[PDB]
Design a protein around this ligand. Structure first.
Ligand SMILES: CCOC(=O)[C@@H](F)[C@H](O)c1ccc(Br)cn1
Length: 295
């Protein structure tokens, strides 16, 4: 028999994820069905999104050889029925206060910083780059969390040294670039570009660096269709473009520039979005989502 979620202490809440205490040395990482667009958490959930993103994380934890925070199987008895398939049993770690970001392509705040200064997070770049330009080798572009509602602040390597130490900062940079390079090549071989990714790490009792976050989900990473990749224009979001198109189109009745919260989504847009998440998972993993555990 599985415990109730109310048997555990709710310890933290995020935009589309939740965290619970299991005992002194273990936590429960939970993915919800909520989705974000244009910096709003939308009213309408995407069915099975939490389960699909958890399947994705478990696949990539398996593929990568680096230590990670998993402390049990996806069907561990300590996981409540209500979150089965969208929750993981993990070990408690001393977390490092650095958002460890790798970028293989120039977009978002990376592109903006380049267009303003000619550099990104202390990396002076060649002249002549633009939207969705390839960056090779990929860049370590660390950031720090700001206040509620605000975007993370981009920082340089020296800033990271002052947060975690010189030797540890070099380790974060090296492991972030190594892991991203491997995952990106794997996805591209199957027709999906991982344009960038954001990692969070912790340290265990022996001093070892441990990957401790969801990993390579379409929330932590920009997924693009490789078949339509064209440097110089904005790329469609593999998972979120149907949501974006409806919200900004003729039928929503919503003006993005009003900064008012958006309306609920059509049921059919939510179902089409679920299909897109399933397509991304099955193409990258080579597995079938119909075999992933659930309630
Ligand atoms: C950059 C270090 O991050 C942390 O310290 C952790 F708390 C972790 O990122 C976290 C936060 C909120 C939720 Br919900 C789940 N996990």
């Amino acid at each position: 028999m599985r415990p109730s979620l109310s048997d555990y202490q709710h310890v933290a809440s995020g935009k589309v994820r939740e965290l619970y205490r299991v005992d002194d040395e273990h936590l429960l990482f939970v993915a919800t069905d909520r989705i974000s667009a244009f910096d709003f958490v939308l009213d309408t959930p995407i069915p099975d999104k939490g389960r699909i993103l958890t399947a994705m994380s478990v696949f990539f934890f398996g593929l990568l050889t680096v230590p990670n925070h998993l402390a049990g199987p996806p069907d561990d008895p300590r996981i409540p029925e209500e979150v089965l398939g969208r929750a993981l049993l993990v070990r408690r770690l001393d977390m490092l206060p650095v958002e460890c970001v790798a970028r293989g392509y120039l977009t978002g705040s990376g592109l903006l910083d380049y267009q303003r200064t000619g550099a990104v997070c202390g990396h002076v770049l060649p002249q002549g780059l633009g939207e969705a330009s390839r960056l090779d080798p990929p860049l370590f572009t660390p950031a720090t969390k700001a206040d509620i509602g605000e975007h993370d602040m981009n920082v340089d390597f020296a800033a990271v040294v002052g947060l975690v130490g010189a030797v540890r900062a070099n380790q974060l940079r090296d492991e972030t670039i190594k892991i991203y390079t491997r995952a990106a090549a794997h996805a591209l071989h199957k027709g999906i570009i991982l344009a960038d990714t954001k990692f969070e790490f912790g340290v265990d009792i022996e001093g070892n660096l441990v990957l401790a976050d969801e990993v390579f989900t379409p929330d932590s990473s920009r997924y693009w269709d490789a078949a339509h990749y064209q440097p110089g224009v904005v790329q469609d979001s593999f998972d979120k473009q149907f949501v974006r198109n409806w919200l900004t189109g003729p039928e929503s009745g919503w003006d993005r520039a009003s900064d008012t919260p958006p309306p609920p989504l059509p049921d059919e847009v939510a179902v089409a979005t679920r299909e897109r998440y399933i397509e991304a998972y099955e193409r990258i993993s080579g597995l079938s989502f119909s075999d992933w555990i659930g309630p």
